[PDB]
Every structure is written in C-alpha cells, then in structure tokens.
Design a protein around this ligand. Structure first.
Ligand SMILES: NC(=O)c1ccc[n+]([C@@H]2O[C@H](COP(=O)([O-])OP(=O)(O)OC[C@H]3O[C@@H](n4cnc5c(N)ncnc54)[C@H](O)[C@@H]3O)[C@@H](O)[C@H]2O)c1
Lengths: 50, 22, 435, 165, 141, 53, 98, 185, 96, 59
C-alpha cells in the first residue's frame, strides 16, 4: 500500500534524474516532497533580506 | 623553544585599510 | 581559364552610367594605385580624428597638449613597455552635444601598442572559431541509423554486391564512420597573455587608423531607441547597416565609471543597425577545461576550454567590421586600472626597481596615497570592506592581523608521537587537525 | 561530475564562467536582446532553482527554511547574535552602492561647473599651432567639432596645405 | 528526410563523447624496470643491462661473464621503436618533445599545476608520491 | 592564508629524520632537538629497552 | 534493489563521506553564541570519551542541537571555534592512549 | 609557516639571524603584487555582493535577492574572500616591515657624507630609463616600433606634395606623378 | 519577523562606520579619493583645496568640503508617470 | 660593492650580484645613436632563445 501503484519502469523519471532528492522514495512511494512555489522562494529569501 | 629574533612585529603590522587620517 | 573568349560583353554602353575614358587627367571613380578591397575615402567613412592619418604623423592625434583646452593627465602614471609607441598621445574627448571639451591623454600601453598583423590573427582566428554554432555541427553516425544488423542475403554464388548491413556512409540512407559531432570539435584555448595583446594591438589600430572617438558620457535623455538615433545624428555616427557602424565600450562618465552599462543607453542601444555595445575590458580570466581528458562522458560541448570569451567582449572581428570605436572615459579608467599591474609586471627589473622612486607603486593599502578613483561597482565594494573590518576585532582568525601570537609563541616537539605543539605562555594552543 | 561550480557567480559580469558554445558572429537586434535576457535567466533560473531546493529540503528537515534550527531561533529570541560574521544583507549592498552613486552625481555637477572655470580661461579665439598641417592634411570633420571653441571660422581650408593663418 | 528519410525518423542508439586512455599508457613497465633512459637533451640512450647475466655461468669465458655487467645502450634501431609509442602524445606538433620514460619531477606536478586543480588541496604538490598519510590515532574502518 | 592558526605539524617520515631533519650535515631543523632531547634514553631504561618510550 | 539511494560512484567516493580535509560543520557561531552552547555541556562530561566514528559512518555534524557534545564532529568543531573566539575550553583534550 | 621574515616555526632549531638592518630594499616587486592583490580582494567583494538588477521584466521576480545562494555566499566569503584578505595582508606586511628598515637606513645614511648624494647612493637611475619613462628625452637608441619615424630616421618616409580637391568633395589627393610600372620580359 | 527584518535593517542604513552610510563616526577614506574635477582642482572647485581653504581661517576643525556622502540626502524614489491624458497617446504609451 | 657603509654596514639591495646581473651599462659612445633597441625580459635576461628544428623527432 505504501508502494507506488505502477511498475516503476513508468515512473523511472523520478529515480535517475535529480528527482532522486525531490521525491519521497521510502519503499517505492515516488511521491513529491514538499516544494515551495516561486512566490514563496522569494517571499522567504527577501524577508530575510538575503 | 621560544622565538627570540623578531619577537615583536606580529602585533605591529597591517594597519587594516588606513583610516581617514592617512 | 581564359575560356569564354566571346559573348561575355555587350558591345554597347548602357546609356546611363557607362562612359568612355577621357584622358590621363580623368580622375576615375574608385581608382587608386594600391590594392585596396575596401576603397574608402574620408567622405564615406570619415575618420573622427584631429588630423588625417599621414605617414609623417606617427598617429593622427594631438601628439602634444594644445593650449586652448583643459588637459587631463592619465588616471595612472605611464610607462612605455616593449611594443609601445614611444610617442605621447592626446585624444580630445567629445561632449554629448558634439562639442569638443577637454582633451585627455591616453595610456601608451593600451592605446600605444603598435600593431603587427600576425598577433591579432591569434585573436581573429579565435573569434572566427569561437563564434560557430558548434551544436549545429551534428551529423548522423554509422551506428545511429536504425537498419537491419543482419545480412538478409548472404553473398554466396551470384553477382550481388559484396555488401550487407548497408547502414554505412556509402548509401543514400547511411551515415559517416567518423562523423562530425560537437564534442569532437575543438574550441581553442585563448590565454589572457595574448588576448590582452590581441586586444591592445587592435584598439591601437583603431587609433592609428584614426577611427577612435572618446565620449564623456554615452547616456541618452530617455531610453527610447529614437533618442539613440537622435544622439547618433548629432554625433554623426553611422549605425546604418551599410555605413560603417560604431563600437561602444560604455564605461560611464569620467567621475562615475561603471562596468554595467548605463541602463538608459543599454535599452536605447537596441537598434537593428550595425552597432555592438561591448564590455569595457580587454582581459578575460584564465582558461580551464574541467573535462580535460574524458572525465564527463555525457557533455555535449566542444573540446577545449570550457570558459569561452563571451560574445560581447572586445574581439577582432567586431573591431574591424565596425569602423568607428566609441569609448567613454569611464572605460579608460577601467582599462588603465585593470592593466596597470600587468603593465608594471612586464618592465625589465632594472626598470621595475625604479618605480617607487618615480611614483608608480603608491599603494593606497599602506596609506602612502589617498585612494585613487575606482569604479562605482568597485568602490561600492571597497566601502563594504572598510565597514566590515570591525567585525574581525575580537576573534583570532581576523584576516587583518593574521597569527598575532606568533611572537610569544614557543614550540616544543613531542618525542612520543611526531608533532610540534606550539605553546603560548606554557599553554598549548596548536589546533591538532581533524584527520 | 566536477565542473568548477565555485565559479558560477564568482565572475565580474553575468556572461562569464558560463560555457555557452552556441554563439554566432553577428547576433542581430533581437538575437542580442535574446542573448542578454538569456544570460541573466540562466543566472536567475539557476538561483531560484537552487533556492527552492535548499528552502524546501530545509523545511522538510523540520528546521527553518534557511537551516536555522531550534538553537539559532532561541538565541535570536535572547538577542545573542548567533552568526559569527553577519555578511552585509541586501539592505546593505543596495545602500552601500546607493550613496556612491549619490556621491559621483554630486561630484559631476561639482565638476561640470569646474571645467567651465578653465574652458572660459581659454582666450584662443583662433586655433593654436596644432592647426598646422605641414605633416598631413587636417580632418574636415573634426574642425566642425572644434568650431565651437573659437570665433573665427576653422573648417575653411584651401586647396593648398594650411599656411598657418 | 535527407540522410535516409526513414532511417533517421525511427531512432536508434545515439553516440556520445568517447572516453580517453591513461595518457601515460605507453611508458609500460617492461621498460620502467628493464631500461633507464640517460642523457642530456637531444641524446637519450635507453641504457640496458647485460643479456646473459643469470642463466648459465659455469664454464662460460672468463672475460665475457662480465660484459654482462655494463649499462650498454640499446642499439638505436630499438631506441626509435620503443620511443615511438611515446612520441604519439601530440603528433603533428613539431615542437612538443616526446614523453619521457620515467616521470620527471616537474611534470608530475604539471598535472596539478593546472588552473582547474588549484582548489584540490589533496592530491596537490605531490600526495601520491608523498609519504603515506597519517591519520587520527582512532582512525578505523 | 588558509590556516588561520597554527595547526600542529607532524614530524616528517622516519626516513627523513634519518637523513635531513635531524642530520647536522644539512643543518636540519631537528639537529638541535635531536641532540638535545631525543638522543637520550628514558631515565629508567637499561640496555635492552633503550628504545622504548 | 529497484531503487538505490546513491549510485556506486558515490558509494565509492569517500571524499564526500569521510571527514578528511573537509569541514563538516557549516555554521560558525559568534562569541556569545558559543558561551551559550557550552552551557549545555553537562558536568561529568569529558571529551576523552566521545570517540571517532569509523570510516563506514558518514561525517555529518547536524549542528549544535540537544546532546550535541556527543556528536564527535560537532564537539571537535565547536572546540575549534572556541579557539578562534578565545573561549576557554574547560574540558579535557583527546587523550591518545599508549 | 613562513611567508614573512619572522622565520617559520622551523626555527625550532634556534637558528638566529644576525647581521641585520643590513639592506635598503625599495619593495618594488612586492608593491606590485600588492596592487595586484588589493585589486582581487575588492574584485572579490564586488562578487560577494552581486544582487539581482534584472533589466528585463521576464525574470524580474528575483530583483531583490543576492546573485548567490545564501549558503554559497556564506562559504565563498569564507573560502576565497577571507583567504584573499590574508593574502593581501601578507603583502601589506612584507612591505610595511621592509619600510621600517628603510626608514632606519635613510636616517643613519643621510648623515655621513651628504644629504644630496644620499638619494643618489640609494638610487637606481640607469642611464637608459629615459627610454621607458620620458621617451621624448631618449635619443641614444632608436626604440620606436615604427622606427622609420624616429627623428633620426624620419628622412625615410616621403613627404608627398598633397592637395585638396573641392570638385571631388574636399578629398585630399597627392600630386605625385605615378611612375610607369614595369611590364614585360 | 517584521522586527528581525527591521532590527537588522537599521544596522545597515546607518550603523556602518562608513559605507555609503554611517553618519556617526567620520568620513570614510574613499570620501577623500583623489578625484580631479579639472587640472588643478580636487575637492571644492570654488577656490584652491576648499577643505584646506577653510583650514586657513578658523574653520579648520568645523568646515568640511569633501562630500562625505553618507551624510547626503537620498532623493525620493522615482515612480511611473501618470497615465496619458489623451486616449490616442494613452494606449500608445501602453505600446512602448 | 653593494655600499655597506661604515654605520654598522647597511647595504643596498640590488647593488651587487655574484650571478652577473646588472643594469645596462649604457650607450657605446655618446656621438652615435644605435638604431635598434633590445629590451630585457621581465626576469632580466636577454632575448636570445635557442629552439630546435623539429623537437618532436629530437633533431
Ligand atoms: N587540509 C585541510 O584540512 C585544510 C585545508 C585548507 C584549510 N584548512 C583549514 O581547516 C580549518 C578547520 O579545521 P580542520 O582543518 O581541523 O577542519 P574543520 O573545518 O572540520 O575544523 C572544525 C570546524 O571549524 C570551523 N571553522 C573553520 N574555520 C573557521 C573560521 N575561520 N572561523 C570559524 N569557524 C571556523 C568549521 O565549522 C569547521 O568545520 C578551516 O579554518 C580551514 O581554513 C584545512
């Protein structure tokens, strides 16, 4: 049930690219992690005045 | 074995970015 | 050759232009005893120079200070290295309103470096190669063809061709064996040692050719393009495609030098004509090729340096296609500043030791001289440092008083394992490194 | 692999240390607007890409989007400065370069007026002895640009080399 | 449409950058032990040792059991054969000298004297030919 | 300029100490220490254990 | 395993793994930001006990956190900024046993 | 570490260095590599503070942030910048130290025989320096690159009897009668 | 957050000793940068060495002519002009 | 040679050279003007360099 519900040859886009980091890979649950939008990456990096 | 020659001179150099007077 | 001995010409003058040759006194259009492939007089591509470049005059500029104009000595003191012209130069700088304000003396190392064709060729041959669209030079390879890999008829007894697996380069559906791929094309490594020379022997050539023009400020009243053609109309530049263009090295005003172009002019310098706003510099960083042998086996790339000179530096191609060169003093300040330490390192030693006597090595870091003029982008960084030197007060890694105990520090080797542990007042301080 | 990533932003402009083999000899009007807009894009396309990664990975580790754990939150609540070297923030640089421009501009007008002190201390209503051309003919274009600094006409050159008057 | 009009629409394998070899490959070790190349510039003998110096000694001539002891040059007909695999490093460049048999001390660093290696503290200034590294007394695998 | 403080330096290899570091013929920098502090055995060592720490 | 957390290229590059010539603590704390870290080093503690993890263990200091003084890399990195800061390291030094 | 005259700690052996204050040195090459090094630390701060000025409205949405990820800039400041300050400081001492000696030399020397010959005893005025500094003064050699224009060799280039032509448009036009070129054999 | 991002803003608008701001301490060394407003003119252009000119009178200690431009007043931010008053020019200026 | 004077011997750095370096002695004789000038290298020595034909073959 935690697995992703498709033969992972279809979702190989996630496993070889740099989506190896941007994805939960616990027991083959190729589900996206949290990811800020671009309205927030600058909302969080300007409020710091970085 | 202490450093007899030039014992000072570590604390007397590179006035960093000389100020308004110089 | 010499074939087609007839029919190539009409025996009739075109009733318009065509014309007999009157006599020896007849001054024929275009005629000249030198083999010139760009026959330009001083009315088509007129030089912006005080005098026309003559063999007598070592350079078509004010060799001396003319009395009726403020003279501005160089930003840096001047020395005459190996190749320089050994002749003083004074180029009058132009007001934006086409008036000629104060005259300014140029640096005889950047603008005095006499030309020699075979050392700007190393610049041109670099550009005519760096400016290919390498990635376009792909081509199919033998393996990349997708045909049967098996001889359908084994050649045994009849008169069929000795061919099978016909995906080679002979057949109209094939590809090469050693094809041209981008990762097999060399982008040439270009040193700063010769890019600088290959830029200075041109920006002198553009001075000896008398096509050099200095402007106080390359700024427009408004960023609209129309204001940049109106500016060109008063200054007389010909940014038309056919009339020889202009090469702006925008460095800003004389007192506000800046590398990042005047935002006003940058947006206004987008005319379809022949003009190219280049960066105010002649150096570029050392080349490097991280994929030197084969490290990255997936790069598309060319071979050679992975740090090509960008398209908008001052190169040889766009220096000879554009007749006139337009430098603001804000660039001259940057060129003399960035090449000063280079100009000095090249003098012979029996000269290099005479500099601090003659006032060339006044080093504003020691305070023997108030700081010289800096680019706004760099003074804004200089001021940053002067404000920060107080965050390094209490610590020991203070980069302005490096190792301030090395006086009272006493070292003592330890015979149990090989180390030399420094002590300061009997107290051990040597940081035993972590692996 | 290793591709000198410590050089991406450490150049003096935006078009430097970015390997772009796809160039051309003459980049046209909109191919140049396309180029300049391109360098900055893959300079800000790269950055906010690399910011969304660090801010999201930090947020998934339970700590502040800039890595600030429970400690460096507790210290700031106490006022104890938690970073050893507070590099100057955006407010700094955009100000440390705001006056420098406010200084040059007040020096231009300080110097625009200055040169007139010396320009009007140039009595020469006739050209100096640079107006010679025994070496080689003068340049008619330039004289028209130097006519302003005189009263007598300058551009009118005879068919002969200038005598001097 | 042009190269094959159907071989280039349906797609096969695409080739990529081909990895290079160990670019000191041809100083193989059956010379790094047998010979040694001596000599001033523009004359490099690959001096070798005697031929018969280990196999059969009893009864051979008294004054020829020692011609096996001198560093004789190998005749140039073989100098050029073995030193041919070393020239190939950059051919058609009439002013680069051949690779040397042994690694001269200045070229080993020449690899790490490149503007790209200046940031590798390890492996710089000689770390391989350095003495074996020393680690924390607790170092353990 | 990358080592802000003195990070202790290990003595060279034993082979180096034999030939240069401790050999007064080169005035090696340990030719003072070697004779002063190292070449003397422990104040308890006999004849067999002259080399043990 | 249909999914490998890391390709063998980075199972075999110990340089990204080991603590060798590589700093393993990113944040550099100020003066008072250290005197307030050592406040939680408990009485009875001694650096002579927290050992070096073997090679097969990654070199990662997650920073000054609860019980940071047991993270051998957080300890000997804080112990090093207390030098550059001048804070007095009370606790003992690595006792190399013989 | 050495890098200055203090002697590296490898004066563990108490190697003294007597017969000192012995040399006046103008620190010529060192002041050169100082101005080179001072340019780097400023050319580094310029980078550590690069902040988005997106002159285009396509990707304007970052026009407030720095041009370097906060973790990297927080590194590059400490890896390359603060290194380059130490490397700048080092030359700022190898010179401020050598001056201290020169300040002592130029006093004990000024006295003995002359305050006029003094800055000649400590000079480096090679007889040819007029070649490099004020080349208008230099005659004893012909060091122009365009040698055929040196005043002692100006008599090579021909002085054409030129003229203007208002009928052609003010074009200058030489009045030399071209010599009939060679034609056949 | 509007505090931390403010308590730290004020420390960079003024709390420089001097860096393009820093009204507290003194002139930064780059204020005295040798700028040549004209041949023989350096900081005042009104007399000769205007800083050193008032150093002749009793104003040596109380007159400063260098533009220690931290002290300078910053112009108000320039904003987009008002839209045009004629629809022909009102929408064409929205075609620039 | 290098002017170590009597006041406890302060010398002057570039004044003596056992290797053979020294500033150019100057012109041959004042009346003549030499028509070529051979500069010195950045490190002092003179412009002569002896390359080889075809180093690749060690000719
Ligand atoms: N071969 C090497 O290991 C090597 C090479 C270059 C520099 N260094 C120096 O090593 C030092 C760190 O000590 P180490 O080599 O035992 O490894 P290390 O970096 O693990 O040292 C412990 C920690 O000290 C901190 N630190 C380092 N420099 C600091 C500074 N200037 N201010 C504040 N905190 C600092 C870092 O958090 C570092 O992780 C660095 O300062 C670095 O410049 C070492």
């Amino acid at each position: 049930a935690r697995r992703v519900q498709c033969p992972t040859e279809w979702v190989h886009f996630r496993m070889h690219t740099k989506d190896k980091l941007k994805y939960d890979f616990q027991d083959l649950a190729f589900r996206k992690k949290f990811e800020y939008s671009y309205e927030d990456v600058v909302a969080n990096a300007k409020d710091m005045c970085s | 074995r202490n450093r007899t020659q030039h014992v000072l001179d570590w604390m007397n150099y590179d006035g960093n970015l000389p100020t308004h007077n110089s | 050759y010499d074939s087609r001995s007839s029919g190539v010409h009409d025996v009739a003058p075109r009733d318009g232009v065509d014309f007999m040759y009157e006599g020896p006194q007849q001054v024929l259009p275009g005629a000249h005893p030198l083999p010139l492939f760009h026959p330009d007089n001083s009315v088509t591509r007129p030089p912006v120079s005080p005098y026309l470049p003559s063999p007598q005059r070592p350079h078509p500029y004010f060799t001396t200070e003319l009395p009726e104009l403020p003279h501005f000595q160089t930003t840096r003191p001047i020395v005459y290295t190996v190749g320089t012209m050994k002749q003083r130069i004074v180029a009058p700088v132009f007001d934006l309103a086409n008036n000629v304000t104060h005259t300014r003396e140029l640096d005889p190392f950047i603008f005095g470096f006499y030309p020699e064709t075979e050392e700007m060729a190393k610049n041109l041959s670099y550009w005519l190669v760096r400016c290919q669209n390498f990635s376009s030079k792909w081509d199919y390879e033998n393996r990349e063809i997708w045909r049967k890999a098996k001889k359908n008829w084994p050649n045994t007894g009849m008169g069929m061709a000795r061919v099978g697996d016909r995906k080679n380069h002979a057949h109209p559906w094939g590809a090469h064996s050693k094809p041209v791929k981008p990762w097999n094309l060399l982008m040439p490594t270009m040193d700063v040692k010769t890019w600088s020379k290959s830029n200075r022997m041109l920006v002198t050539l553009k001075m000896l050719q008398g096509k050099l023009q200095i402007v106080e400020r390359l700024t427009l009243p408004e960023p609209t393009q129309e204001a940049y053609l109106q500016l060109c109309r008063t200054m007389g530049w010909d940014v038309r495609h056919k009339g020889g263009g202009a090469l702006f090295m925008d460095g800003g005003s004389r007192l506000t030098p800046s590398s990042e172009y005047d935002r006003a002019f940058f947006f206004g310098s987008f005319f379809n004509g022949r003009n190219k706003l280049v960066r105010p510099t002649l150096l570029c960083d050392e080349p490097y090729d991280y994929n030197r042998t084969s490290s990255k086996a997936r790069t598309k790339g060319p071979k050679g340096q992975k740090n090509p000179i960008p398209i908008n530096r001052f190169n040889a191609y766009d220096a000879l296609t554009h007749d006139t060169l337009i430098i603001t003093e804000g660039a001259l300040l940057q060129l003399e500043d960035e090449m000063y330490t280079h100009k000095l390192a090249m003098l012979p030693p029996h000269i290099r030791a005479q500099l601090p006597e003659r006032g060339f090595l006044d080093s504003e870091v020691l305070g023997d001289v108030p700081p010289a003029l800096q680019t706004v982008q760099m003074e804004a960084a200089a001021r940053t440092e002067e404000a920060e030197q107080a965050m390094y007060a209490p610590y020991y890694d203070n980069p302005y008083h490096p190792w301030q105990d090395e006086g009272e520090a006493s070292y003592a080797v330890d015979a149990v394992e090989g180390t030399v542990q420094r002590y300061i007042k009997s107290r051990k301080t040597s940081w035993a490194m972590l692996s | 692999g290793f591709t000198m990533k410590y050089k991406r932003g450490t150049g003096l402009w935006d078009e430097d240390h970015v390997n772009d083999f796809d160039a051309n000899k003459y980049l046209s009007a909109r191919s140049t607007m396309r180029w300049y807009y391109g360098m900055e894009r893959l300079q800000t396309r790269n950055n906010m890409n690399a910011r969304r990664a660090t801010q999201s990975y930090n947020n998934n580790m339970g700590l502040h989007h800039s890595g600030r754990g429970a400690f460096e939150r507790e210290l700031e609540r106490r006022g104890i400065q938690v970073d050893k070297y507070p590099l100057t923030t955006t407010t700094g640089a955009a100000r440390v370069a705001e006056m420098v421009l406010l200084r040059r501009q007040e020096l231009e007008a300080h110097a625009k007026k200055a040169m007139e002190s010396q320009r009007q201390a140039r009595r020469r209503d006739a050209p100096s002895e640079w107006y010679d051309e025994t070496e080689g003919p003068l340049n008619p274009r330039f004289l028209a640009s130097m006519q302003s600094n005189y009263t007598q006409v300058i551009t009118e050159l005879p068919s002969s080399p200038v005598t001097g008057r | 449409p042009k190269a094959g009009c159907e071989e280039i629409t349906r797609q096969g394998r695409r080739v990529v950058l081909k990895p290079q070899e160990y670019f000191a490959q041809h100083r193989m070790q059956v010379w790094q032990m047998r010979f040694k190349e001596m000599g001033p510039p523009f004359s490099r003998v690959w001096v070798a040792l005697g031929g018969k110096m280990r196999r059969r000694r009893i009864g051979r001539q008294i004054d020829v059991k020692d011609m096996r002891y001198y560093w004789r040059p190998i005749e140039p007909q073989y100098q050029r054969l073995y030193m041919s695999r070393l020239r190939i490093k950059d051919h058609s460049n009439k002013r680069v000298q051949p690779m040397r048999l042994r690694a001269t001390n200045n070229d080993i660093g020449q690899a790490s004297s490149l503007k790209e290696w200046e940031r590798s503290s390890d492996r710089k200034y000689g770390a391989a030919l350095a003495p074996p590294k020393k680690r924390d007394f607790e170092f353990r695998v | 300029e990358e080592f802000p403080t003195f990070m202790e330096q290990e003595l060279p290899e034993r082979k180096g100490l034999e030939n240069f570091a401790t050999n007064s013929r080169k005035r090696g920098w340990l030719a003072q220490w070697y004779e002063d502090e190292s070449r003397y055995a422990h104040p308890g060592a006999g004849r067999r254990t002259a080399h043990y720490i | 395993s249909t999914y490998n957390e890391k390709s063998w290229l980075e199972k075999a590059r110990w340089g990204a793994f080991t603590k060798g010539s590589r700093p393993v603590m990113r944040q550099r704390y100020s003066a008072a930001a250290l005197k307030e870290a050592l406040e939680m080093v408990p009485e009875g503690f001694e650096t002579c006990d927290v050992p070096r993890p073997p090679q097969r263990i990654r070199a990662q200091s997650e920073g000054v956190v609860g019980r940071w003084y047991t993270n051998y890399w957080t300890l000997h990195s804080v112990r090093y900024q207390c030098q550059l800061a001048g804070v007095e390291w009370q606790f003992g030094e690595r006792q190399r046993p013989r | 570490s050495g890098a200055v005259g203090r002697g590296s700690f490898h004066s563990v052996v108490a190697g003294a260095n007597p017969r000192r204050i012995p040399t006046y040195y103008n620190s010529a090459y060192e002041l050169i590599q100082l101005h080179r090094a001072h340019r780097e630390v400023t050319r580094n701060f310029l980078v550590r503070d690069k902040v988005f000025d997106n002159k285009f409205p396509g990707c304007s949405l970052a026009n407030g942030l720095f041009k370097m990820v906060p973790n990297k800039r927080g590194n590059f400041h400490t890896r390359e910048l603060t290194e380059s300050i130490r490397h700048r400081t080092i030359w700022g001492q190898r010179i401020q130290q050598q001056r201290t000696i020169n300040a002592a030399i130029l006093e004990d020397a000024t006295k003995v025989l002359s305050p006029a010959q003094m800055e000649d005893r400590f000079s480096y005025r090679t007889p040819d320096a007029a070649a490099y500094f004020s080349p208008q003064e230099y005659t004893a050699a012909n060091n122009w690159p365009n040698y055929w224009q040196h005043p002692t060799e100006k008599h090579v280039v021909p002085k054409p009897r030129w003229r203007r032509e208002p009928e052609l448009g003010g074009i200058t036009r030489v009045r030399d009668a071209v010599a009939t070129p060679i034609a056949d054999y | 957050q509007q505090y931390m991002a403010e308590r730290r803003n004020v420390e960079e608008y003024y709390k420089w000793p001097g860096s393009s701001t820093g009204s507290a301490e003194s002139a930064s060394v780059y204020d005295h940068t040798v700028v040549e407003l004209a041949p023989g003119v350096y900081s005042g252009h009104r007399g000769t060495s205007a800083i050193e000119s008032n150093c002749v009178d009793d104003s040596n200690d109380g007159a400063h002519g260098v533009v220690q431009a931290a002290r300078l007043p910053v112009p108000p931010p320039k904003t987009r002009p008002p839209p045009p008053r004629n629809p022909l020019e009102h929408i064409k200026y929205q075609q620039r | 040679s290098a002017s170590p004077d009597a006041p406890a011997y302060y010398a002057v750095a570039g004044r003596d050279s056992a290797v053979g370096y020294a500033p150019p002695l100057g012109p041959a004789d004042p009346v003549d003007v030499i028509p070529f000038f051979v500069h010195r290298s950045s490190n002092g020595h003179l412009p002569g360099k002896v390359y080889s034909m075809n180093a690749k073959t060690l000719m």
